[PDB]
Amino acid sequence: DINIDDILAELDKEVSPQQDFSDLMKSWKNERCSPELLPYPHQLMKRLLNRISMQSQLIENISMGSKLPLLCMETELERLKFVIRSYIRCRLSKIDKFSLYLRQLNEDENSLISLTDLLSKDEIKYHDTHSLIWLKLVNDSILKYMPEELQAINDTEGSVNMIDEPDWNKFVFIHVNGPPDGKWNEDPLLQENEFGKPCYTVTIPDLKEEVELTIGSIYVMRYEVIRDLLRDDKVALI
Amino acid sequence: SLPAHLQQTFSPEEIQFIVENEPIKIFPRITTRQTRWQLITTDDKALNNMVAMRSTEVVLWIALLLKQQSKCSIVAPQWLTTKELDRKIQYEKTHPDRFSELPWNWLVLARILFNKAKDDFHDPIHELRGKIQDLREIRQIKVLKGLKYLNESHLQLDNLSLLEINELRPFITEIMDKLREIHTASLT
Amino acid sequence: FFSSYGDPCIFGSDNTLLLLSKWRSPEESKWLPILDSNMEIWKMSGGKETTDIHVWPLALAYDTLNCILVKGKHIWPEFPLPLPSEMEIRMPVFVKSKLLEENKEEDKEIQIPVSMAAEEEYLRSKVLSELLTDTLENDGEMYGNENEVLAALNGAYDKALLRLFASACSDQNVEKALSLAHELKQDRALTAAVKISERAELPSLVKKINNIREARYEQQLK
Numbered sequence: 001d002i003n004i005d006d007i008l009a010e011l012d013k014e015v016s017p018q019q020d021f022s023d024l025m026k027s028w029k030n031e032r033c034s035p036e037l038l039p040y041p042h043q044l045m046k047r048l049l050n051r052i053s054m055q056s057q058l059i060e061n062i063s064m065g066s067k068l069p070l071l072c073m074e075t076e077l078e079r080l081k082f083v084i085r086s087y088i089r090c091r092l093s094k095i096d097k098f099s100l101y102l103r104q105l106n107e108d109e110n111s112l113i114s115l116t117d118l119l120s121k122d123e124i125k126y127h128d129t130h131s132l133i134w135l136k137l138v139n140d141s142i143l144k145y146m147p148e149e150l151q152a153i154n155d156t157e158g159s160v161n162m163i164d165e166p167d168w169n170k171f172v173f174i175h176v177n178g179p180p181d182g183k184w185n186e187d188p189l190l191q192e193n194e195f196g197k198p199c200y201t202v203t204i205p206d207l208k209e210e211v212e213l214t215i216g217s218i219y220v221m222r223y224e225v226i227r228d229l230l231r232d233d234k235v236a237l238i
Numbered sequence: 239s240l241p242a243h244l245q246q247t248f249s250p251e252e253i254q255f256i257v258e259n260e261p262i263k264i265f266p267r268i269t270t271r272q273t274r275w276q277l278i279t280t281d282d283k284a285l286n287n288m289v290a291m292r293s294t295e296v297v298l299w300i301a302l303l304l305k306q307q308s309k310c311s312i313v314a315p316q317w318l319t320t321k322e323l324d325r326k327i328q329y330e331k332t333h334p335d336r337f338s339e340l341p342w343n344w345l346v347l348a349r350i351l352f353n354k355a356k357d358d359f360h361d362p363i364h365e366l367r368g369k370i371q372d373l374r375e376i377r378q379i380k381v382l383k384g385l386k387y388l389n390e391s392h393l394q395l396d397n398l399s400l401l402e403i404n405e406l407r408p409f410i411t412e413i414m415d416k417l418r419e420i421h422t423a424s425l426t
Numbered sequence: 427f428f429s430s431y432g433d434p435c436i437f438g439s440d441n442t443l444l445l446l447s448k449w450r451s452p453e454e455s456k457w458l459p460i461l462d463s464n465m466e467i468w469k470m471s472g473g474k475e476t477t478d479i480h481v482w483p484l485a486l487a488y489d490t491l492n493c494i495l496v497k498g499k500h501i502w503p504e505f506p507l508p509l510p511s512e513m514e515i516r517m518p519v520f521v522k523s524k525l526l527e528e529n530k531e532e533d534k535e536i537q538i539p540v541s542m543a544a545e546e547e548y549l550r551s552k553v554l555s556e557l558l559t560d561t562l563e564n565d566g567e568m569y570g571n572e573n574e575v576l577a578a579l580n581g582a583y584d585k586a587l588l589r590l591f592a593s594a595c596s597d598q599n600v601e602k603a604l605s606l607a608h609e610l611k612q613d614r615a616l617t618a619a620v621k622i623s624e625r626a627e628l629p630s631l632v633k634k635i636n637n638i639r640e641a642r643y644e645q646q647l648k
Contacts, residue, residue, distance in 0.1 A: 093239040
């Protein structure tokens with residue numbers, strides 16, 4: 001019999017502050033779990049901080065001018081500020097642990113990414129000056145007494161490597177979202193399993209093995225194996 | 239800098255905070271439709287356009303904020319009823335490996351609504367408190383069977399709740415990491 | 427009680443809701459059956475006779491009944507007051523035996539032919555639009571937006587008719603399809619009907635629809 005659902009669809013059809021907070025929640029949750037330091041959202045933070053300032057002035061103006069709407073506005077601003085506070089504290093904690101690694105990544109002239117791409121201006125200031133403070137402390141206290149072959153602080157060639165770096169093979173929990181627009185027919189990686197949902201396929205190279213990541217199922221997976229799909233928002237960390 | 243207990247995981251307070259951003263259905267006892275709310279992380283139209291005893295949808299934290307006072311009443315989710323919970327227990331017993339398809343926030347939302355909104359249910363609350371317990375016990379049996387398959391490569395989970403995952407996270411990931419270290423050391 | 431727009435309404439001992447239409451015009455005033463509670467509980471129960479359940483009405487808000495769902499011996503509520511429920515009106519068109527045959531987890535609500543659903547929607551849209559129109563014609567808008575609801579009802583009305591029309595075309599009943607085409611309002615819908623007729627491979631009906639579209643375009647130009 002004659003289908004018309006498409007005829008009805010074509011007949012029938014004839015950035016926001018809400019979205020930014022969802023992106024902030026996404027960034028916060030991903031930053032907490034992942035082993036590496038993810039790149040800073042430069043644009044989002046500018047817009048959010050401006051909005052916070054304007055809302056604060058509006059609350060003051062209305063206060064100086066029913067109680068309940070003010071209640072809602074005040075506690076909403078508290079809820080918004082808490083997330084940003086937690087997020088920035090986590091990022092600074094990551095910068096403490098990978099300071100020499102980030103410095104070495106910046107000193108490499110052939111690096112595919114610059115340190116200013118990855119970090120915010122405040123983070124750059126913190127990294128630079130904190131490294132000098134720590135360096136002065138150990139340089140005078142310990143290294144002043146060592147012979148010239150052992151006076152380097154970031155030595156790679158010694159019997160133990162003095163530089164730490166992320167564990168790229170850490171296990172993480174994931175939830176498979178698919179492409180964000182619902183465009184299952186457009187995603188080139190998204191093949192299909194038999195009589196069911198679409199899926200992605202990944203190769204785990206130490207074992208020479210494959211797995212199928214169906215939409216909507218949860219997995220415990222190595223970080224490096226799923227890094228590209230995470231960067232493309234095909235999956236989200238639980 | 240960050241506390242030691244927050245290096246790799248979310249505390250239950252953060253889990254409650256995450257769940258509180260979801261929408262929920264309410265009956266208001268006052269009309270706001272013709273100051274205005276002027277929120278910045280949500281829609282603002284719904285709260286500005288309320289009419290008494292007309293059903294509407296808002297975020298859960300504002301819903302609990304209103305229900306603190308006379309001004310509001312909360313409609314329970316449809317899965318949170320005796321008939322549906324009976325069917326889910328039967329599914330759990332019937333399929334001895336699969337987890338039943340409850341929503342990702344079922345434990346958190348049940349233990350919020352039973353405290354803040356004990357008066358707004360239709361079923362007797364002393365039966366719901368029993369059936370929630372039955373579901374959690376059966377799921378714990380199924381979890382204890384699954385921890386015999388920790389391995390060097392991966393694992394699949396389905397319909398396991400957020401709080402249930404967060405409860406187990408530091409054990410699964412640690413033991414799995416050490417099995418990986420032992421295996422790769424023999425390859426190198 | 428009176429509706430939320432002053433229409434007279436009453437709930438019968440048969441547990442049916444009746445509304446008086448066209449009361450402003452005595453040669454056109456008429457009583458309309460707009461909702462049967464028993465039929466709703468029958469479908470809700472999966473086609474079962476849960477006579478332990480009773481409906482206690484409260485008030486009518488536009489298209490939706492406010493009511494208490496009472497269970498047990500006594501067919502009326504008690505203290506402390508249980509919370510109310512909300513329920514939409516729908517036209518009485520269905521048959522139990524036919525819907526059981528169409529249907530043929532154990533309590534799952536019975537599945538209905540698309541023809542019945544579209545028919546019921548078109549009737550419900552028509553009645554709702556007429557009542558709202560009469561209200562606006564005499565008493566105007568209270569709030570400044572009810573015309574938009576009336577526009578939505580007209581869209582739903584043509585949409586329901588297009589599905590029924592397409593069914594008639596798929597059955598190749600040109601006579602019934604043409605009779606249905608007269609009842610469509612917007613030329614958007616008539617254009618869709620032309621496309622539907624092309625899919626049905628009915629050039630005679632394409633011709634006659636375009637005759638109607640040209641005639642109605644002339645009436646629109648006049």
